[PDB]
Amino acid sequence: VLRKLKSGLERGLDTFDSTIEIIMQNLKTELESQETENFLEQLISRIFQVVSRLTGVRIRNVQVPDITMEATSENSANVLIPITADVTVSLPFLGEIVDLDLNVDLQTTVSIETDTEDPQVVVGECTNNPESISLTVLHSRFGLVNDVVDIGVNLARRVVSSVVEGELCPRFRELLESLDAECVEKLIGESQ
Amino acid sequence: VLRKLKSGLERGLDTFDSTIEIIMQNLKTELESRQETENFLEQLISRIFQVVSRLTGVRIRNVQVPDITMEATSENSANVLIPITADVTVSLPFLGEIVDLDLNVDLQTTVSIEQVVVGECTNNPESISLTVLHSRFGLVNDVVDIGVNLARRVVSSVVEGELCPRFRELLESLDAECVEKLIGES
Ligand SMILES: CCCCCCCC/C=C\CCCCCCCC(=O)O
Ligand SMILES: CCCCCCCC/C=C\CCCCCCCC(=O)O
Numbered sequence: 001v002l003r004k005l006k007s008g009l010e011r012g013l014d015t016f017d018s019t020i021e022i023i024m025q026n027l028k029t030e031l032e033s034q035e036t037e038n039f040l041e042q043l044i045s046r047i048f049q050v051v052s053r054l055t056g057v058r059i060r061n062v063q064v065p066d067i068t069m070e071a072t073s074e075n076s077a078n079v080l081i082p083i084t085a086d087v088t089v090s091l092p093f094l095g096e097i098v099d100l101d102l103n104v105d106l107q108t109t110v111s112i113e114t115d116t117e118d119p120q121v122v123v124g125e126c127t128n129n130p131e132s133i134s135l136t137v138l139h140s141r142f143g144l145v146n147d148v149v150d151i152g153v154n155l156a157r158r159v160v161s162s163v164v165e166g167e168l169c170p171r172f173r174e175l176l177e178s179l180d181a182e183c184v185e186k187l188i189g190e191s192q
Numbered sequence: 193v194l195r196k197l198k199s200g201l202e203r204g205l206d207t208f209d210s211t212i213e214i215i216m217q218n219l220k221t222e223l224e225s226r227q228e229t230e231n232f233l234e235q236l237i238s239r240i241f242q243v244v245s246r247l248t249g250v251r252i253r254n255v256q257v258p259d260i261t262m263e264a265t266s267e268n269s270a271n272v273l274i275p276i277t278a279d280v281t282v283s284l285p286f287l288g289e290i291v292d293l294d295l296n297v298d299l300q301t302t303v304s305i306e307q308v309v310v311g312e313c314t315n316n317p318e319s320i321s322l323t324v325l326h327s328r329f330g331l332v333n334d335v336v337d338i339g340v341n342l343a344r345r346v347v348s349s350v351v352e353g354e355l356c357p358r359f360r361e362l363l364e365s366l367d368a369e370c371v372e373k374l375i376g377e378s
């Protein structure tokens with residue numbers, strides 16, 4: 001069972017590693033003003049390093065290729081965060097059952113309230129859509145068509161889904177809420 | 193890995209099921225009045241393996257003793273042979289049932305008259321035979337090997353810890369004349 005991960009996610013994975021909180025604060029200050037993506041790679045790696053200690057799902061080599069902003073209207077934009085990582089699933093007695101490529105696309109919206117010189121920022125929902133999590137099989141020492149692979153892919157999906165809901169989406173919203181209203185207004189500007 | 197079985201074997205598997213000791217006593221009385229003894233042995237061994245099923249994901253049932261044979265080695269000594277057959281299923285976490293095996297175990301000890309002496313009951317790995325019948329995960333891949341290895345270790349530790357000692361204990365309960373009468377059949 002993923003009991004250990006479920007209890008860990010209830011507490012917050014940051015209760016297992018003091019450095020997550022520090023990286024969060026580094027991201028806050030950096031956002032006031034290439035490097036932000038580097039700080040995000042660090043935050044996500046450390047969260048996944050804690051998941052590696054609680055589960056046999058080991059997620060390494062975390063990259064954020066490019067953070068994009070697409071204007072949805074004059075006063076709203078989607079903020080897009082593409083994540084890649086290498087995944088290996090291990091079970092007791094069997095050791096390494098499968099190596100996967102992971103793609104996660106986190107999306108959230110920022111809006112500015114219309115008809116005011118003192119605009120309020122609203123950050124929308126961070127939806128954990130199963131279509132946003134992609135797992136590709138690279139290798140299994142048991143054979144690619146073996147049933148262990150399917151169990152491996154399923155276990156990885158559950159872990160990744162639960163840490164998107166429990167950690168990444170909440171921190172994505174928390175980091176957007178740290179932006180001053182003018183900064184958001186300026187960034188939603190020339191998203192057009 | 194097998195901690196729970198190892199702790200179980202140190203206590204005695206009969207501390208988990210009051211019926212084992214009753215079946216032991218049934219076998220003792222039944223012997224004094226020398227199929228049926230084999231039926232009591234099937235029951236004793238099933239129950240020991242029912243306890244092992246509670247301590248491990250190695251489930252052993254359909255336990256049979258085809259025929260107990262005694263071959264006279266001299267006028268006052270014989271080899272006593274007990275063939276055991278059983279169906280085995282190994283389960284692991286997340287995978288569930290990984291393999292179904294056929295188990296054959298051949299226990300051998302000697303009984304002599306001095307005073308009855310029962311010889312050692314040797315746990316030879318050649319005396320435990322495990323045959324693959326079915327696997328969800330392929331017949332010759334590494335899942336099966338892990339399954340067969342776990343079953344061997346469990347069966348080996350239960351032979352050493354429970355079956356061989358009970359085999360010796362039951363033979364040592366026979367009086368000298370009983371053994372002389374049974375060796376009577378070379
Ligand atoms: C665990 C995931 C946390 C994600 C936190 C994201 C915080 C950063 C948010 C917004 C950055 C500003 C948008 C930049 C748009 C310009 C385009 C570019 O940078 O290439
Ligand atoms: C766990 C194993 C315990 C074994 C206890 C040993 C019991 C042996 C009993 C009697 C031996 C007499 C053998 C005579 C041959 C004919 C018997 C027969 O085949 O039915």
Ligand SMILES: [Ca+2]
Binds near residue numbers: 017019046
């Ligand atoms: Ca650290």
Ligand SMILES: [Ca+2]
Binds near residue numbers: 146149150
């Ligand atoms: Ca498959």
Ligand SMILES: [Ca+2]
Binds near residue numbers: 009166167170
């Ligand atoms: Ca949380």
